[PDB]
């Protein structure tokens, strides 16, 4: 993985991003709309059952009640939830409030935990975004086309803008997460190695990371306003606000609203005001970790006979610019016979990255054609040929460094090897010829240790 492991699982990315935030921002995060998200995104039952324990108990409990609640045949699963206890960063171990090592949760989060489960009040039904009492009365299939257009524009920036001329700043945004790579001889950015896998599963889990990308700056942006705004589209459809958000807003709320609309999770009316309605893709974000859909017959079907892998053709306007972005295949006279002489076109794209797991994922999981009709394994004997093409780019290495030669003793060269290894500037060592490669970044420090020993 090159930057997508934290996207498949949502409960792991939220705990990692929470550890590197400001203490004043985390205080405002502990609200009533955030209580239904730190538990629903989880999966194990042990990490979810401890939330109800800290709600009824008013006094801190020691660790003796925890080591006994596992009875005798359950402490093995207790160590798995130990690392997760520090991920949410909501508990606190005291000294001895009534026994030994008393565990207590932040009372700021405990107050808002009962509002969204048992107790209530009034401010919860007054603020917008989190509520917004408004029904839907607009053509639903007419708005589904705008949800696909928001994601199609992103595809143009990954290729090089073949026919788009919008002013959306989306090329630099995806470059921070390692998805888009800036072209060195030119100026339109291309795509990285991890960007190919995003155009395969087509899951709305990646759009959740794009919303928290602007918050990573930690300058003048708060999380309490983003968390209360992201809860709008999480309630599927029939969750609006008419014009209640217009009266209660500011300059910071309008900035995050324009960026979320361009992602493909919510649709906004003209003039960037009036009534807003979330898209259809936001339903799959709260359902599971992935999803499928978009076809009813699946006309595509590959070949499992030869080795050039005849890719599928004739589908829609999505697979036309998608295969050319992978490795730029070829086409003949009829209905665009793609991938017919794959021998040199694949090696052109592998020279800029080790894109080996994305081609196999696109060859095996493209529309589920062979695994439903046929029975044996989809790839024949190409699993070894693909690995051979990746090893061809390992025959050389373009890196700089300095070499030290002509020593005197053998036991003296072994001491110098530990100097470059601890600092992290050592690449390759040789005890038979007394040779060591040192990167130029730490060249001014290795020469000092040799003059003293």
């Amino acid at each position: 993985s090159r930057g997508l492991n934290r996207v498949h699982l949502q409960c792991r990315n939220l705990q990692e991003f929470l550890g590197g935030l400001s203490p004043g921002v985390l205080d405002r995060l502990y609200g009533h709309p955030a209580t239904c998200l730190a538990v629903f995104r989880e999966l194990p039952s042990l990490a979810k059952n401890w939330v109800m324990r800290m709600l009824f108990l008013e006094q801190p409990l020691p660790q003796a009640a925890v080591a006994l609640w596992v009875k005798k045949e359950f402490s093995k699963a207790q160590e798995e939830s130990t690392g997760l206890l520090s991920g949410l960063r909501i508990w606190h171990t005291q000294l001895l409030p009534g026994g030994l090592q008393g565990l207590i949760l932040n009372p700021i989060f405990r107050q808002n935990l009962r509002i969204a489960l048992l107790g209530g009040g009034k401010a919860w039904s007054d603020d917008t975004s989190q509520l917004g009492p408004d029904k839907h009365a607009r053509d639903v299939p007419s708005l589904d086309k705008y949800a696909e257009e928001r994601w199609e524009v992103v595809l143009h920036f990954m290729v090089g803008s073949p026919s788009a001329a919008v002013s959306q700043d989306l090329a630099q945004l995806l470059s921070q997460a390692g998805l888009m790579k800036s072209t060195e001889p030119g100026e339109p950015p291309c795509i990285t190695s991890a960007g190919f896998q995003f155009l395969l599963l087509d899951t709305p889990a990646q759009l959740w990371y794009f919303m928290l990308q602007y918050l990573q700056t930690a300058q003048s942006r708060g999380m309490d306003l983003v968390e209360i705004l992201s809860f709008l589209f999480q309630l599927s459809f029939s969750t609006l606000g008419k014009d209640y958000s217009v009266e209660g807003m500011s300059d910071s709320l309008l900035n995050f609203l324009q960026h979320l609309r361009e992602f493909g999770l919510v649709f906004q009316r003209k003039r960037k005001s009036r009534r807003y309605y979330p898209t259809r893709l936001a339903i799959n974000l709260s359902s599971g970790v992935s999803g499928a859909g978009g076809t009813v017959h699946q006309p595509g079907f590959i070949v499992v006979e030869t080795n050039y892998r005849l890719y599928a053709y004739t589908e829609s306007e999505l697979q036309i610019a998608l295969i050319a972005l992978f490795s730029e295949m070829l086409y003949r006279f009829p209905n665009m016979v793609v991938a017919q002489v794959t021998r040199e076109s694949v090696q052109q794209a592998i020279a800029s990255g080790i894109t080996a797991q994305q081609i196999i994922h696109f060859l095996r999981t493209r529309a589920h054609p062979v695994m439903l009709k046929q029975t044996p394994v989809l790839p024949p004997t190409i699993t070894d040929q693909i690995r051979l093409w990746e090893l061809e780019r390992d025959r050389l290495r373009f890196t700089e460094g300095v070499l030290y030669n002509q020593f005197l003793s053998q036991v003296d060269f072994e001491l110098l090897l530990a100097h470059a290894r601890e600092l992290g500037v050592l690449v390759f060592e040789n005890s038979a010829k007394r040779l060591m490669v040192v990167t130029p970044a730490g060249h001014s420090d290795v020469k000092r240790f040799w003059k003293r020993q």
Partner: protein, 295 residues
């Protein structure tokens, strides 16, 4: 991704709950609805794609509190898995929108049941055996549709509050074996009345016969022990171990069977002191009563 279901059997008895308030009690009939308000919300907090099912137990029938049998929740189901024709309340389930509507049906359905209790027919007690006969027919209808892709892991919750009546206790055992085929779990939550038939549903299927001491301490024994997830119940250990043991004795006889024999060839287990028939129209040879009567 994953859905669950919890069938709560509430023993709404106006006779028992009507006399408990006289003994200076703070958990009466008005507070019994609060148990569903908490258990119904904590079940949806772990997963917003769950379903709620509450069945009452009245002295005349087993009225469905949620969904009701009227023209609102009878023909059209207000389940979260039906986006069409139900979305002003089934859209904001993540707080107090759909959860409040789930409890509102119980309050609306109980209106017709409380007013239809003139008690003019002397006393008939609560037909507790007829409550479980309706829960199996409801979990089987939803399982046939959800059997694809999903699995829907559910349980059965029983809350006992009174004794039985003149009903045949054999009908209470038919729902036990009919539930073992579907690999389901049956629970029991007694309050004051104790019976030996409800405990059998926890030993055959592998449930738990929990005894509730005081009434206000009810939210503790229905959230951790009676958890619909049933994933960590094997190593939970919270209620005290079962000490007493009640099973079944004779059918139509006033004695505790332990070595007795039936009437003849039927199934009415009686005693060993029977040379001929008893309450049937069969016969029996005299090749064994002369042997058993001697010693």
């Amino acid at each position: 991704d994953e859905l669950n279901l919890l069938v709560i059997v509430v023993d709404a008895n106006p006779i028992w709950w009507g006399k408990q308030a006289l003994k200076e009690s703070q958990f009466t009939l008005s507070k019994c609805i609060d148990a569903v308000m908490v258990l119904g919300n904590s079940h949806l907090f772990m997963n917003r794609s769950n379903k709620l099912a509450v069945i009452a137990s009245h002295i005349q029938e087993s009225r469905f509190l949620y969904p009701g049998k009227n023209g609102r929740l009878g023909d059209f189901f207000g389940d979260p898995g039906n986006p069409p024709e139900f979305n002003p309340s089934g859209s904001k389930d993540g707080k107090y929108e759909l959860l409040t509507s789930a409890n509102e049906v119980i309050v609306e359905e109980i209106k017709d049941l409380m007013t239809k209790s003139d008690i003019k027919g002397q006393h008939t007690e609560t037909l507790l055996a007829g409550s479980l006969a309706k829960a199996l027919c409801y979990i089987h209808r939803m399982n046939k549709e959800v059997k694809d892709n999903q699995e829907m892991k559910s349980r059965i919750l029983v809350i006992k509050a009174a004794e039985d009546s003149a009903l045949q206790y054999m009908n209470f055992m038919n729902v036990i074996f009919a539930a073992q085929k579907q690999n389901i779990l049956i629970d029991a939550c007694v309050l004051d009345s104790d019976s030996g038939l409800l405990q059998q549903a926890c030993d055959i299927t592998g449930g738990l016969y929990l005894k509730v001491p005081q009434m206000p301490s009810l939210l503790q024994y229905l959230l951790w022990v009676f958890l619909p997830d049933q994933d960590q119940r094997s190593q939970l250990i919270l209620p005290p171990p079962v000490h007493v043991d009640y099973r079944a004795a004779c059918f139509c006889h006033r004695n505790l069977i332990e070595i007795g024999y039936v009437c003849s060839v039927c199934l009415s287990i009686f005693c060993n002191f029977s040379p001929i028939c008893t309450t049937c129209e069969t016969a029996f040879k005299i090749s064994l009563p002369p042997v058993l009567k001697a010693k």
